[PDB]
Every structure is written in C-alpha cells, then in structure tokens.
Amino acid sequence: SRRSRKLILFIVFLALLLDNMLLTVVVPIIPSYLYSVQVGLLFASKATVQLITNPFIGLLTNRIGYPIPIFAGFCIMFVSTIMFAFSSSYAFLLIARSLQGIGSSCSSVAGMGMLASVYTDDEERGNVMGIALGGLAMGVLVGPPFGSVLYEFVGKTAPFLVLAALVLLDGAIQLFVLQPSRVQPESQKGTPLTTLLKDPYILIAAGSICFANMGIAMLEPALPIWMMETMCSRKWQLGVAFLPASISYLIGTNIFGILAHKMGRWLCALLGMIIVGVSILCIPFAKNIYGLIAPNFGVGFAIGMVDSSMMPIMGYLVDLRHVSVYGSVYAIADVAFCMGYAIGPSAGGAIAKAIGFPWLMTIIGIIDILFAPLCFFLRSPP
Ligand SMILES: NCCc1c[nH]c2ccc(O)cc12
C-alpha cells in the first residue's frame, strides 16, 4: 500500500505489546534467576532508567526524526531480550533491566510521537491512540499464561527465545516500510521542554494521568501481600484477583477511544477519576474475592477511560497552543506513566508496612477524588 498509514498503528501497537510481554514474563523468572528485599529492585531500576531516559528521547526524536528512535528501540529491545535470556549474575539482571528501560522509553515515546504526527484529526487520532494503547492491556493480559506454559513445558529460556523470534519477525517488517536508512530532521523546531513544564494545562493532564496510573501501580504489589494476610487465599487466586483489571482496561481503552470525543474529554477524565476513587475506596472493606472482582473491574475500566480519553488531549493541547510537535509532550506523558510505575511498588510496600493497607486504599482514593475536579479546566483551554 501507499505509505501504509495503518501499519504505523500496527507497529506501535505490537511494540507496546511486546514491551509489556517483557515487563510481565519477568515476574516469575526473577525469583528463579535470583536463587540460581531486592526482588522488586529490578522493577524500580527499570522504571527509573525509563524516567531518566524519556526527556532525552523526546528531544532526540525531533532533533533527528521519528523512525530512527523506533528502529533503535527494536534493536535495543532485541539485545535486551537476548541478554536477559542468557543472564546468570545479578549485574546481568540489572543491565538487562537498564537496556529494557532504554528500549521501552525510546519505543513508546517515538511511537506516540510518530502516531500523533501522522494523524492530526482529533476523531481518528483519539481512535488510533486508543487502539494502540489497547496493547498496554493486551500484553499484560497474555503475558502470564503464555510465559508460564512456555517456561514450564519445554524450557526456561524457550519463552524468551520465541519472544525474540517474534521481535525479529516484526523488525523484518516496518524496516523497508519506514526506511530509516537516512536521517530526516523535523520541518519546524519544537518547543523546549522547560516551557511545557510551565504550562498549567499540560501539568494538570500529566498529574491526573500520573495519579490514575499510580492507583494501579500501588495496587499491583500490595494486593497479593494482603489477601494472604486476612482472607488467607491460596496461590491459585493470586493471579485471578488481578486478572479482571486487564480486561477492563482493554475494553475501556478500545471503546472510549471513539466515545470520548463524542461525550467530552474533560468530562470523561473526571468520570474516570471519580470511578477510580470510589472503586479503590470500595476495595479494602470487601472480604471475599467475589466482592473484590467488581471493584477491580471498575478501577481497570476507569483507568482505561482516563488513558484512552486523555492521551490524545496532550497532542491536542500542544497543537492548539504550542508548536505542532508531539515528542516532548508525549515524553512528559510517559514520564508521568513511569514515575507512577517507579514509586508504585517500593513506596507502596513501604507505606503499607508502616500503615494499614485499607488506609493506603483510602488515602489513594481521597487523593484521586480531590484531584478529580481539577480536570474541569480542560473544558476549553485558551
Ligand atoms: N496504564 C496501565 C495501568 C494498568 C491498568 N491495569 C493494569 C494491569 C497491569 C499493568 O501492568 C498495568 C495496568
């Protein structure tokens, strides 16, 4: 086809898919590699490398162009996967995590920027960013079972080998299509990152996205270390308790990518934050898994609402009241994502150890509810 416009969507979607496959299949492999706390230190290290790397990639992607960081991300992700598979020492795990963070940052930021650049009209742009961000749910949904069956059936390194084969298969395509053999700088100079961080609307959007993803990032490690404490659940229910969140996030991200602009971006974000707050408030006093599935469904659906309805609004803001570039603003969006992901596990575990887990749920819900009215300012920015 001519320039294969939807193929950019496909490549971004599959890049996020495989990024989350790496981000999730690592969970049961970390304790096995460590034996043959510091178990969560790898996740924090990857997220911190990600955070440090996002602004530099944001400047780089309009310094030289969009396809070069995407190809570099595919190369560094393949290298990270290979090294992770052939990893024994703890420092090997750390360097694999660092390369993983570099790849995730550059791939996500460059893909979002290129997707924003190719598609300008708000309807289709919201649609395609919702479809692409559906990969963020698809990867974590298909991660655990695929990884577990390939790990426990044929070998430990076999899932990584098959994943590397898939990554190479996707790198074979979008190489001639994107033809990144030559550098192509941007038509116009972009706004500096400093002035974007002085813009109240961009800051409000980044903060709301950060708090929304922060809720899930806090819930991810704290829930398994809580059901064993009070309902004394077995290991069979550990994955099932967090399972519905992925389905809810996928459904919300896929459908409100078209429903959001029809209904209203600011109102959708406010409703999503309110639903996050009430659902997280509902989680702790529930006692059985039957009473825990529904609030998890709600929180996943509302996170999908916020993300799918408020990822394209950053591009909308920078297009309406700034220079028409998206690399830096999507870099700060990914900074919000992964600063939440960084201070999620470790800080959440620390505050749960110091103060009761129901108090943690209540305080996160209170913060979400209190910050939710601040999304009203996005109704009509000057
Ligand atoms: N935007 C990602 C937030 C989120 C919602 N549900 C999730 C499940 C797994 C995960 O890694 C992340 C999430």
Coordinates of N, CA and C in Angstrom, one line a residue, residues 239-357:
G239 N -3.3 -14.7 40.9 CA -3.4 -14.1 39.6 C -4.9 -13.7 39.2
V240 N -5.8 -14.5 39.7 CA -7.2 -14.3 39.3 C -7.7 -13.0 39.9
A241 N -7.2 -12.6 41.1 CA -7.7 -11.4 41.8 C -7.4 -10.1 40.9
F242 N -6.2 -10.1 40.3 CA -5.8 -9.0 39.5 C -6.1 -9.2 38.0
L243 N -6.6 -10.4 37.6 CA -6.9 -10.6 36.2 C -8.0 -9.7 35.6
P244 N -9.1 -9.4 36.3 CA -10.1 -8.6 35.6 C -9.7 -7.1 35.2
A245 N -8.6 -6.6 35.9 CA -8.2 -5.3 35.6 C -7.7 -5.1 34.2
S246 N -7.0 -6.1 33.7 CA -6.5 -6.1 32.3 C -7.6 -6.1 31.3
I247 N -8.6 -6.9 31.5 CA -9.8 -7.0 30.6 C -10.5 -5.6 30.6
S248 N -10.8 -5.1 31.8 CA -11.5 -3.8 31.9 C -10.7 -2.7 31.3
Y249 N -9.4 -2.7 31.4 CA -8.6 -1.6 30.8 C -8.6 -1.7 29.3
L250 N -8.5 -2.9 28.8 CA -8.6 -3.2 27.4 C -10.0 -2.7 26.8
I251 N -11.1 -3.1 27.5 CA -12.4 -2.7 27.0 C -12.6 -1.2 27.0
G252 N -12.2 -0.6 28.1 CA -12.4 0.9 28.2 C -11.6 1.6 27.2
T253 N -10.3 1.2 27.1 CA -9.4 1.9 26.1 C -9.9 1.7 24.7
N254 N -10.4 0.5 24.4 CA -10.8 0.3 23.0 C -12.1 1.0 22.6
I255 N -13.0 1.1 23.6 CA -14.3 1.7 23.2 C -14.4 3.2 23.5
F256 N -13.8 3.7 24.5 CA -13.9 5.2 24.7 C -12.9 6.0 23.9
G257 N -12.0 5.3 23.1 CA -11.2 6.0 22.1 C -12.1 6.6 21.1
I258 N -13.3 6.1 20.9 CA -14.3 6.7 20.0 C -15.4 7.4 20.8
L259 N -15.7 6.9 22.0 CA -16.8 7.5 22.8 C -16.4 8.8 23.4
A260 N -15.1 9.1 23.6 CA -14.6 10.2 24.5 C -14.8 11.5 23.8
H261 N -14.4 11.6 22.6 CA -14.6 12.9 21.9 C -16.1 13.3 21.7
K262 N -16.9 12.2 21.4 CA -18.3 12.4 21.3 C -18.9 12.9 22.6
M263 N -18.5 12.3 23.8 CA -19.0 12.6 25.1 C -18.3 13.9 25.7
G264 N -17.0 14.0 25.5 CA -16.3 15.1 26.0 C -15.1 14.6 26.8
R265 N -13.9 15.2 26.4 CA -12.6 14.7 27.0 C -12.6 15.0 28.5
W266 N -12.8 16.2 28.9 CA -12.7 16.6 30.3 C -13.7 15.9 31.2
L267 N -14.9 15.7 30.7 CA -16.0 15.0 31.5 C -15.6 13.6 31.6
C268 N -15.1 13.0 30.5 CA -14.7 11.6 30.6 C -13.5 11.4 31.6
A269 N -12.6 12.3 31.6 CA -11.5 12.2 32.5 C -12.0 12.3 34.0
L270 N -12.9 13.3 34.2 CA -13.4 13.5 35.5 C -14.2 12.2 36.0
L271 N -15.0 11.7 35.1 CA -15.8 10.5 35.5 C -14.8 9.3 35.8
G272 N -13.8 9.2 34.9 CA -12.8 8.1 35.2 C -12.1 8.2 36.5
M273 N -11.7 9.5 36.9 CA -11.1 9.7 38.2 C -12.0 9.4 39.3
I274 N -13.3 9.8 39.2 CA -14.3 9.6 40.3 C -14.5 8.1 40.4
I275 N -14.6 7.3 39.3 CA -14.8 5.9 39.4 C -13.6 5.2 40.0
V276 N -12.4 5.7 39.6 CA -11.2 5.2 40.3 C -11.2 5.4 41.8
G277 N -11.6 6.6 42.2 CA -11.6 6.8 43.6 C -12.6 6.0 44.4
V278 N -13.8 5.9 43.9 CA -14.8 5.1 44.6 C -14.5 3.6 44.5
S279 N -14.0 3.1 43.4 CA -13.6 1.7 43.4 C -12.5 1.4 44.3
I280 N -11.4 2.2 44.4 CA -10.3 1.9 45.3 C -10.8 2.1 46.7
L281 N -11.7 3.0 47.0 CA -12.4 3.1 48.3 C -13.2 1.8 48.6
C282 N -13.8 1.2 47.6 CA -14.6 0.0 47.8 C -13.8 -1.2 48.1
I283 N -12.5 -1.3 47.5 CA -11.7 -2.5 47.6 C -11.5 -3.0 49.0
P284 N -11.0 -2.1 50.0 CA -10.4 -2.7 51.2 C -11.5 -3.4 52.1
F285 N -12.6 -2.8 52.3 CA -13.6 -3.4 53.3 C -14.2 -4.6 52.7
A286 N -14.1 -4.9 51.4 CA -14.5 -6.2 50.9 C -13.7 -7.3 51.4
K287 N -14.3 -8.4 51.7 CA -13.7 -9.6 52.3 C -13.4 -10.8 51.4
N288 N -14.3 -11.1 50.5 CA -14.1 -12.2 49.6 C -13.7 -11.8 48.2
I289 N -13.2 -12.7 47.4 CA -12.8 -12.4 46.1 C -14.0 -12.1 45.2
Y290 N -15.2 -12.6 45.5 CA -16.4 -12.2 44.8 C -16.6 -10.7 45.0
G291 N -16.4 -10.2 46.2 CA -16.6 -8.8 46.4 C -15.4 -7.9 46.0
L292 N -14.3 -8.6 45.5 CA -13.1 -7.9 45.0 C -13.0 -7.8 43.5
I293 N -13.7 -8.7 42.8 CA -13.7 -8.7 41.3 C -14.3 -7.5 40.8
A294 N -15.5 -7.1 41.3 CA -16.2 -5.9 40.8 C -15.4 -4.6 41.0
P295 N -14.9 -4.3 42.2 CA -14.1 -3.0 42.2 C -12.9 -3.0 41.4
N296 N -12.2 -4.2 41.2 CA -11.1 -4.3 40.3 C -11.5 -4.0 38.9
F297 N -12.7 -4.6 38.5 CA -13.2 -4.3 37.2 C -13.5 -2.8 37.0
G298 N -14.0 -2.1 38.0 CA -14.3 -0.7 38.0 C -13.0 0.1 37.8
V299 N -12.0 -0.2 38.6 CA -10.8 0.6 38.6 C -10.1 0.4 37.3
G300 N -10.0 -0.8 36.7 CA -9.5 -1.0 35.4 C -10.2 -0.3 34.3
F301 N -11.5 -0.3 34.4 CA -12.3 0.4 33.4 C -12.1 1.9 33.4
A302 N -12.0 2.4 34.6 CA -11.8 3.9 34.8 C -10.4 4.3 34.4
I303 N -9.4 3.4 34.6 CA -8.1 3.7 34.2 C -8.0 3.7 32.6
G304 N -8.7 2.8 32.0 CA -8.9 2.8 30.6 C -9.6 4.1 30.1
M305 N -10.6 4.5 30.8 CA -11.3 5.7 30.5 C -10.3 6.9 30.4
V306 N -9.6 7.1 31.5 CA -8.7 8.2 31.6 C -7.6 8.2 30.5
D307 N -6.9 7.0 30.4 CA -5.8 6.9 29.5 C -6.3 7.1 28.0
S308 N -7.3 6.3 27.6 CA -7.8 6.4 26.2 C -8.4 7.8 25.9
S309 N -8.9 8.5 26.9 CA -9.5 9.7 26.6 C -8.6 10.9 26.8
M310 N -7.4 10.7 27.4 CA -6.6 11.8 27.8 C -5.2 11.7 27.3
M311 N -4.8 10.6 26.7 CA -3.6 10.6 25.9 C -3.6 11.5 24.7
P312 N -4.6 11.5 23.8 CA -4.6 12.4 22.7 C -4.8 13.9 23.1
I313 N -5.3 14.2 24.3 CA -5.5 15.6 24.6 C -4.2 16.3 24.8
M314 N -3.1 15.6 25.2 CA -1.8 16.3 25.2 C -1.4 16.8 23.9
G315 N -1.5 15.9 22.9 CA -1.3 16.3 21.5 C -2.2 17.4 21.1
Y316 N -3.5 17.4 21.5 CA -4.4 18.5 21.1 C -3.9 19.8 21.7
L317 N -3.5 19.8 23.0 CA -3.1 21.0 23.7 C -1.8 21.5 23.0
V318 N -0.8 20.7 22.7 CA 0.4 21.2 22.2 C 0.2 21.6 20.7
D319 N -0.8 21.1 20.0 CA -1.1 21.5 18.7 C -1.9 22.8 18.7
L320 N -2.7 23.1 19.7 CA -3.6 24.2 19.7 C -2.9 25.5 20.3
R321 N -2.0 25.3 21.3 CA -1.4 26.5 21.9 C 0.1 26.3 22.0
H322 N 0.7 25.6 21.1 CA 2.2 25.5 21.0 C 2.6 25.2 19.6
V323 N 3.8 24.8 19.4 CA 4.3 24.4 18.1 C 3.9 23.0 17.8
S324 N 3.5 22.7 16.6 CA 3.0 21.4 16.2 C 4.0 20.3 16.3
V325 N 4.5 20.0 17.5 CA 5.4 18.8 17.7 C 4.8 18.1 18.9
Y326 N 5.1 16.8 19.0 CA 4.5 15.9 20.0 C 5.5 15.1 20.7
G327 N 6.8 15.1 20.3 CA 7.7 14.2 21.0 C 7.9 14.6 22.5
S328 N 8.1 15.9 22.8 CA 8.4 16.3 24.1 C 7.1 16.1 25.0
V329 N 6.0 16.5 24.5 CA 4.8 16.3 25.4 C 4.5 14.9 25.6
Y330 N 4.7 14.0 24.6 CA 4.4 12.6 24.9 C 5.6 12.0 25.8
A331 N 6.7 12.6 25.7 CA 7.8 12.3 26.7 C 7.4 12.6 28.1
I332 N 6.8 13.8 28.3 CA 6.4 14.1 29.7 C 5.2 13.2 30.1
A333 N 4.3 12.8 29.1 CA 3.3 11.8 29.5 C 3.8 10.5 29.9
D334 N 4.8 10.0 29.2 CA 5.5 8.8 29.6 C 6.2 8.9 30.9
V335 N 6.8 10.1 31.2 CA 7.3 10.4 32.5 C 6.3 10.3 33.6
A336 N 5.1 10.7 33.3 CA 4.0 10.5 34.3 C 3.7 9.1 34.5
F337 N 3.5 8.3 33.4 CA 3.4 6.9 33.5 C 4.4 6.2 34.4
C338 N 5.7 6.4 34.1 CA 6.7 5.6 34.7 C 7.3 6.2 36.0
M339 N 7.0 7.5 36.3 CA 7.2 7.9 37.7 C 6.2 7.3 38.6
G340 N 4.9 7.1 38.1 CA 4.0 6.3 38.8 C 4.4 4.9 39.0
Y341 N 4.9 4.3 37.9 CA 5.3 2.9 37.9 C 6.6 2.7 38.8
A342 N 7.4 3.8 38.9 CA 8.6 3.7 39.7 C 8.3 3.8 41.2
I343 N 7.5 4.7 41.6 CA 7.2 4.9 43.0 C 5.9 4.1 43.4
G344 N 5.5 3.2 42.5 CA 4.4 2.3 42.9 C 4.8 1.2 43.8
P345 N 5.6 0.2 43.3 CA 5.9 -1.0 44.1 C 6.6 -0.7 45.4
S346 N 7.8 -0.1 45.4 CA 8.6 0.1 46.6 C 7.9 1.0 47.6
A347 N 7.5 2.2 47.2 CA 6.9 3.1 48.1 C 5.5 2.6 48.6
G348 N 4.8 1.9 47.7 CA 3.5 1.3 48.2 C 3.7 0.2 49.2
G349 N 4.7 -0.6 49.0 CA 5.0 -1.6 50.0 C 5.5 -1.0 51.3
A350 N 6.3 0.0 51.3 CA 6.8 0.7 52.5 C 5.6 1.3 53.3
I351 N 4.8 2.0 52.6 CA 3.7 2.7 53.3 C 2.6 1.7 53.7
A352 N 2.5 0.6 53.0 CA 1.6 -0.5 53.5 C 2.2 -1.2 54.8
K353 N 3.5 -1.3 54.8 CA 4.1 -1.9 56.0 C 4.0 -1.0 57.2
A354 N 4.2 0.3 57.0 CA 4.1 1.3 58.1 C 2.7 1.5 58.5
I355 N 1.7 1.6 57.6 CA 0.3 2.0 57.9 C -0.5 1.0 57.2
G356 N -1.6 0.6 57.8 CA -2.5 -0.4 57.3 C -2.9 -0.3 55.8
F357 N -3.0 -1.4 55.1 CA -3.4 -1.4 53.7 C -4.7 -0.7 53.4

